[model samples]
Target chain A: MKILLIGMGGTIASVYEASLSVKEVLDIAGIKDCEDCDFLDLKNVDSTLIQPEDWVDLAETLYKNVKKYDGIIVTHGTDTLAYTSSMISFMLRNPPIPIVFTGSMIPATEENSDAPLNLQTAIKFATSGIRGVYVAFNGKVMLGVRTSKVRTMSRDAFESINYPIIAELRGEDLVVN
Target chain B: MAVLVIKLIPGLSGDIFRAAVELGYRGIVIEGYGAGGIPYRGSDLLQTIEELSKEIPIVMTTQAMYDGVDLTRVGRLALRAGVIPAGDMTKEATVTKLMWILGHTNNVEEIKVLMRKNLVGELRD
Candidate 1:
């Protein structure tokens, strides 16, 4: 199952410069080994820098590539990930394949970075045959619109607001919640 | 189809609702306080909603973070004032659904029916 991984920079791809201020500098290739999926480095900015027009571009990109790939995974900043997911869910109606979003509170370069695992899990859920928008974060899969960032720095940064979690990743097993 | 999403603040005035109609908004989505309650003590928003519902559809949702707008729970006045409950939909989904519904039809009854229907998995039973 081929997946298209689109990267829009977030904390997951940020790094501390010599000045000690964090900047979005890493791309998808730096996040994880993507030998199994295709890549599109759309933008490298903090999630706060993402706008409604960016959501439109992402949706249009997905719409154009939906037929080519089995699923699509997006790497976004956690700050507005839920908002983007909700807006994209509205923009791309009934997407034929899963469009999963994931990001990490810590950069991929950190010792115990959450980026690699989250990206890996996002790809797994994207190709899991779930034909809807979702946010795969930490170890949980949440419905796109129903998600909100509840905790700022926790590995479990997002929570499904007013809806049940869609799935969970336990070790190597994908558990439907 | 323009649907205005208005947040009800304390001491809110009815003029805002009138301005929405005057601005040629096709519908309204009120983000009310605590289970869709508008300020009845100091504001005429409820009366304005009732007055406006005759001309356009008015959907009521809550500003509170969770559990959505439940008219049956704490919005009896809003319910009686002709504001439609948004049920379990988030404000984003509610506004999007309202716009999509108004895009297809303008009939108030048809809009109500369509808004209540689960389109695109936005609404729950």
Candidate 2:
């Protein structure tokens, strides 16, 4: 089944340019430009620009796309990722498709970029036929609402809240709890 | 808004009421025994509630978590004294809701009604 990648800006889409744009970084990540990607572009602005109205739009979009793809992946900034994810969790009940929300601590174009690993893991998790929304980061996957961003600059910046991390990516295998 | 918790024991006196009033808590939650049984005869507890009612909202609750307060067990004397039942709230949520209710309205009857009304994250069904 084909997958849809929804973009909302964050470090994953950030570039080394004076003014980083999301559309540019995705192209650099080998994701092709707007033409090659089915762009459901919400905003190329910072994570701070995301709000409840945008979240509403996201939920609506997911509901519309629920049956078409095997799963869906969303890229959003880490700053308020948990808040948006939790709001989405409470918005929709028992979603049939796996909705993976992911972003990177470093930009894709950086020399030792974490974005590629994050993007790769996100696509894998999304396509896996899991049930709920998740926050895929570092080498761990966590339930979206149960995770909160713990550090700004740390590579493993998010942690699960009163819950265990969902999975750990060692190599080809995902050890899920 | 401040909260007052009345640690319920077998024999409670008027002095406790006087102390609670002097301490100036917006409301009092009484942790009563087995399905909300309190001292009925010569209960300075009733008098304390009557006295406190003039000043602050007085709420009644059983120490039990699952089954709530049974007003019938406490009888008419407690009701006439104007003590309200805190329906299915952990003490923490009750105190917070009481303070919130008192912050907005001062009318004793209205405050009592609100204590049972279930606003915000305060109560469970």
Candidate 3:
């Protein structure tokens, strides 16, 4: 599926306490820049620093470009990741395609970082044709509107509050809800 | 307009509720305990809410964080005290919705109606 990688930086796009571009982040995740996939480095700010006005900016970008791609992947900080996703769920109202949000708790440069696995699974779900906003992390896919970052440090940091997780990654196979 | 969100704990004082208004907050969201359990007898929270709600919009979302608050028992009392029930919305949804609504309109009646009605799928069925 044709996808657009919109980078709103977080730990996934950082190493040695410095910012890294979306291109480098994709390389670290071993995700190639294929003909069908394009990249946009939209913001380099931490998620905690994202303000409400910024939500409008992000919505405008998605509102204008969502129809251009088969799917969209947003890389962000888990700190306020759920808020951003949930706000866009309301802001975009009913996006026709998938808008998957993914971020890593651990820096991608670390030996045991979860960035690659999380990004790959997020891509997997986005390419799977499911619609609506979602948060893809720790191999679990949750609805953006119903998700919360419950744990600050655990790999399974997000929970689908008051609802069932849409799917989970099991041996590279997606176990759909 | 700034809003204060209070996650209720045992033995907590209700002064924070009124203090918010004194501090110039335009709205409040209370993370009431359990499925709509609120402090009434041991504290003045209910009275404060009843008195201050006339001036500002106060929303009640469950602190349980799963499912939501039901208007049975004192949950209904909270509603009578002018608490806006946030059905099945997450805490973030509750806070964001209140602030979003307050941002547009501060009219108490309009805010109450809008908070009860689902605007952007935040309030689940």
Candidate 4:
């Protein structure tokens, strides 16, 4: 299944205050390039800098691309990630394919960065037969609107507020739980 | 249109709320204690809402963040004082939606109708 990776610029691509392009981030995360995958850069800024118009722009972009790609994955900043997810969920109520968002608490440039596994989980779940908006982080999959970034700078920064986690890491697979 | 969000805490003054209307805020969202109950001990707060209920649409939200806001029996005071109950919506969703609704209309009845209708899956049915 082909996947579209759209980058929105966050800690996953951060090297101090600056952010790298999507392709650079994939390479640094050691995610091998694939013919089945395409890259696009949606924005380059900390999510804290996001405005209401940005949410509309993102939903519009996703709306235009959902038909062309089998699955979609977006990288966003941890701060305000939940808000974006909730807005996207509101905007795209019945998406045909899986649309997943993920980001790292620690910058990918740092030692022991959480970017790789978090991204790995995102990609894995995007193709895991889901048909809704979701957030993949710290090896757990949560419904997009149900998620909240409860902690700062921790790998397990998000919690599925008042909702159960939809999936979690199980050995070599992300099992729906 | 401006939507002011106030996290209600003990002994919070109503002057801030009164100034909201004088300052030209179009709407208000109060994150009240359990079940969206506004503290009535401070009469100024309720007084402000009672006085300005016609000018602005005030939405009552809960800081509990779990079961959502229910102003039914739990918050009769706020319900009578003209605060609309935000049904099971997160504070983020409530504030954003209030801002969105205010953009469309300033009529309190129209705002209440819009809020009760789930525009974008923001609240439970």
The CA lDDT of each predicted structure is: 0.77, 0.69, 0.83, 0.81
Q: What is the lDDT of residue A8 in candidate 2?
A: 81
Residue-level lDDT of model 1, residues A79-165, one tens digit each, is 888778877887787889899988788877677887767876786788689889999988889888778778787898888878898
Residue A139 C-alpha lDDT in model 1: 84
- Of the candidates numbered 1 and 3, which has the greater DockQ value? 3
Off by over 4 Å in 3: A16-18, B119-121
lDDT of 1: 0.77
Worst 10 residues of 2 chain A by lDDT: A16-25
Give candidate 1 regions above 4 Å deviation.
Answer: A16-33, B1-9, B17-29, B51-58, B73-76, B80-82, B99-111
As for model 1, its CA RMSD to the true structure in angstroms is 4.2
Task: State the fraction of real interface contacts model 2 keeps.
Answer: 0.00
Tens digits of per-residue lDDT, candidate 1, B20-120, equal 88999999988887777866765677677779887888998887778877777648877777778888787766776676667678887787787777756
Query: For model 2, what is the alpha-carbon lDDT of residue A13?
Result: 75
Candidate 2 stretches greater than 4 Å from native:
A16-27, A30-39, B1-125
Say which candidate scores most in DockQ. 3
Ranking by TM-score: 3, 4, 1, 2
Interface RMSD of the candidates, in order: 2.3, 10.2, 1.7, 2.6
For residues B1-125, what per-residue lDDT tens digits would candidate 4 score against the true structure? 57788888877877897899999999888888888777676357887787677679988887775777777763888788888888887666666667666766889988888778876555676
Per-candidate alpha-carbon RMSD to the true structure: 4.2, 11.7, 2.1, 2.4
**DockQ ranking, best first:** 3, 4, 1, 2
lDDT of 4 by residue, A1-177 (tens): 889988889888888233798777877887885568888899888889977788889999999999998899988998888878877877787899999999898877777988888888888888886888898999999878677787885899987765678898666687898
The residue pairs in collision within model 4 are none
Model 3: colliding residue pairs: none
Please give each candidate's TM-score. 0.80, 0.56, 0.91, 0.89
